[PDB]
Design a binder for this molecule. Structure first.
Ligand SMILES: O=c1[nH][nH]c(=O)c2cc(OCc3cccc(F)c3)ccc12
Lengths: 196, 198
């Protein structure tokens, strides 16, 4: 059911857990961020333990692993958001109806590089200069190049137009962004609070 | 895993099952339909057996049953649509990103009718090139609801000082609900497709 690295929730279903600086889990997530954002200052990293979001995501993951006949469907990506959206994402995940640029489709956008999500247009500095970025488990699955105005990914072969790609990208050979068009294709795993 | 009265699907993920008149299952849907739509005639009623949509929907239902306090969270509602949308809905369900602007808008989501007569309007159940009209009968997790408003992209909060604790859906009128709007994927399961004609 619930992942091993999660800590006890006293029979509750939602908790934001601040990570201890210098332990393995904190160090792994900090490393992913500082690869492109070494010039920023990390205030804290919180593990998001949202049982409902996790359950709905794990269901979609098992479905995509069955449909794709292989289990290489997940990537870790970044998502910058404004402070006022943070409670929403913690509790409800990412909502294409809320989503800035949509040149590759009307979905939720995720960056390969923290540096892209660190842009003020995405991770808007709050009145205290705090910026907020998620590390997100994303079911990118089998992907294709996106285009403006997509409401879902294109068909995997427009002879069978309901069999869809899982996500779209800017560039299939060297992707820097992914767009997903369904709820529960993305699990917000950590929230990084940082400053310029 | 799947309802024990579904047809054996032979490790296939999706089947449409044609129902037989005189069976309770057909006759109950026909009665629900003809209660407001006696001037149309049913061609056929198909049960939709979509394993993945059922799984995702049932998880959302379990979640809402846990969250809410012994509420009847699920209603059986109608959805009229055009022929062009039927294969998508059968396979992928109801997508708010594809939704029509309703003549009376209570938010930017997917609309479901209490009365078949509403879904039977040509604006929704557009007759195809053969004069067939299509209406789903849908399990909808309405949960705890409030009157909607045209600007909504999710249900409103129950409490403006806790913006993330949302109503489950919105309606046109809480005293006499005739439509519901839902704003999330897997909150509605297309259970039957009614094909009907003038
Ligand atoms: O981290 C993000 N948070 N919120 C976003 O909307 C977002 C958007 C985003 O790509 C937008 C885009 C569109 C077209 C061309 C581009 F080069 C880039 C990348 C990251 C983010």
């Amino acid at each position: 059911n619930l992942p091993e690295h999660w800590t006890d929730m006293n029979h509750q279903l939602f908790c934001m857990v601040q990570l201890e600086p210098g332990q393995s889990e904190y160090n792994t997530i900090k490393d992913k961020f500082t690869r492109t954002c070494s010039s920023y200052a990390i205030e804290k990293i919180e593990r998001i333990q949202n049982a409902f979001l996790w359950q709905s995501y794990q269901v979609k993951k098992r479905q995509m692993d069955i449909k794709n006949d292989h289990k290489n469907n997940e990537r870790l990506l970044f998502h910058g958001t404004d402070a006022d959206s943070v409670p929403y994402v913690n509790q409800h995940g990412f909502n294409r109806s809320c989503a800035n640029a949509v040149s590759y489709g009307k979905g939720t956008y995720f960056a390969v590089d923290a540096s892209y999500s660190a842009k003020d247009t995405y991770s808007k500095p709050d009145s205290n200069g705090r910026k907020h970025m998620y590390v997100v488990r994303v079911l990118t699955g089998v992907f294709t190049k996106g285009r403006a105005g997509l409401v879902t990914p294109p068909p995997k072969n427009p002879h069978n137009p309901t069999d869809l790609f899982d996500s779209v990208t800017n560039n299939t050979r060297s992707p820097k962004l992914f767009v997903v068009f369904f709820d529960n294709q993305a699990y917000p795993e950590y929230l990084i609070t940082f400053t310029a």
